[PDB]
Amino acid sequence: VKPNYALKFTLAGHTKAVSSVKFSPNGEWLASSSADKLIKIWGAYDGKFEKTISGHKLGISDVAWSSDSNLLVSASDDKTLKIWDVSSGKCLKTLKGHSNYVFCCNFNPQSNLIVSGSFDESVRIWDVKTGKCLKTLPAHSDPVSAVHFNRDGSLIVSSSYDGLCRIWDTASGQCLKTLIDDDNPPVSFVKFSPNGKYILAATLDNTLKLWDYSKGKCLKTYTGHKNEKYCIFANFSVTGGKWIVSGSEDNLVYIWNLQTKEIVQKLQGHTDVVISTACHPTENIIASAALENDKTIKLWKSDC
């Protein structure tokens, strides 16, 4: 099998580089964050502008949806996170605690917690209801590039430019495991597989790796793309064929066969680094977003 993603929409709304695009769990919306201090909500199927959400004092590096698709959390250079009522665009909570740029964020599957990573080299765990920081994990020795809950919510995976990938116990905050590469390249992105068994880790040596963190063995390796400078999102595509999907610094979207590790498709259209890619929860739809020279969001549809 081979995917046939084709360009359906190009969304131009941000005046600065886009940083992150995420689909709502209910499949209705796409949220985009940008260096222009703004969040925008679009229709996932038609690209129709729904709303602009503002309030952050500086640029935004990441956004994430709650499981009920009602809340958004955003991570900003203004050292804070913000919890937003999507339907009103009102800031429900301002998460204060980090001492530098907040770079990455995610809700847990229950959506009672938020995990954040920061340029202050720490990973924080916040209570959604009260907005209070529950835990501060002294996670890394460099800016935290990604943070992600497993499907059970009990584990938090984190990555950093320091070369480490860590598995943390959510309940205790203890570093349950530490993945180590002897060559130690900066880890620019990490994410649990949709089964919690593996983690997909990007390193700034033009490499993606599917790791079994338990045994500490690299199961898969995906190459061909360019990634040496930016923290580019990667994804497990599961609605059709089992793909690995990632942006690239050569302006392309790369799609690999997960098992064979072969590049099965390259999506062309962006004219700057494709910093972000996301996969629709139910449909074979990919969203992509690019940096300053581009500033657009693109939606791609495939049959398989």
Add this chain to the structure above:
Amino acid sequence: ARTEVY
């Protein structure tokens, strides 16, 4: 920050 090179 994500849109800039560290």
